[PDB]
Amino acid sequence: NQYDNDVTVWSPQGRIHQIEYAMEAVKQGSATVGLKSKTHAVLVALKRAQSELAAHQKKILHVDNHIGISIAGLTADARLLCNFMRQECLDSRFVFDRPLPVSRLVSLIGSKTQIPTQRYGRRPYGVGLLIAGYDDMGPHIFQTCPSANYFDCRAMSIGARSQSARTYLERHMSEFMECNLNELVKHGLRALRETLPAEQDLTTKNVSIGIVGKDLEFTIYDDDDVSPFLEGLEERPQ
């Protein structure tokens, strides 16, 4: 395990271990699910508070007038790529006087998080971004990784036991395209109710839902504008 030391050292198998350990830091975060229609994009997260009295630590943070990101893993690095995210938004908003499409934003995240994965004494970023926004060609749901490999998906999920969310999503990916918002969101957080053990709620105080649309600016709802969405769901089976 002497080649588990640094980011510089290659394995004798060809797998740089610091990236794998940072993926382990991705899996330790809570679950979150982002999924798009043809006309909208919805990303839904699940908060996980420390104790009873402490409020739940939030996940979804506002970034631009159309770009919103979820998070899992570390928090300070999420503020770091958050501040770089804002700054590269309002740079081109300051210069070109147009908003940025998403598909050229994420190359700045890859070329931003690349150099701390190669040079000596630089850790990667424990990061869990689920980017969502509009360019002119509709919605996009991306994901990142500490290895800086970004995936254009139609739906993903990252966090603790998020594979159950995927195995929910594959048998509804043929039906996640046409539908509008009110059933799209609950189609979202059904994956969250499969990320939990089946003996506790699914409460109102924890789930946060973010939507970006054409005639709808990027908006975060928090327990109380969420309370009109959680009404009318099916019971968990026996």
């Binding site: 809570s30 908060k47 996980r48 508070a49 420390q50 104790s51 594979q163 195995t167 089946a198 026996q238």
Partner: protein, 62 residues
């Protein structure tokens, strides 16, 4: 009704012998439940019951 994908999807590093013991403690609580038959809600509990590690605490997140 048992998925068998539930484990198979969530099985990571699980040895073929551990799976033999997964049905044991799942059947052990089924024993002390006085239950007639074993169910997946009893099964899937035995997944994280045998592995891994803990107890420690659940907080910060809840």
């Amino acid at each position: 009704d048992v998925n068998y994908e539930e484990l198979a999807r969530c099985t990571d590093d699980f040895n073929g012998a551990q799976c033999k013991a997964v049905c044991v403690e799942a059947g052990m609580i089924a024993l002390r439940r006085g239950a007639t038959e074993l169910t997946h809600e009893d099964y899937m509990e035995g997944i994280l019951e045998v592995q891994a590690k803990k107890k420690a605490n659940l907080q910060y997140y809840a």
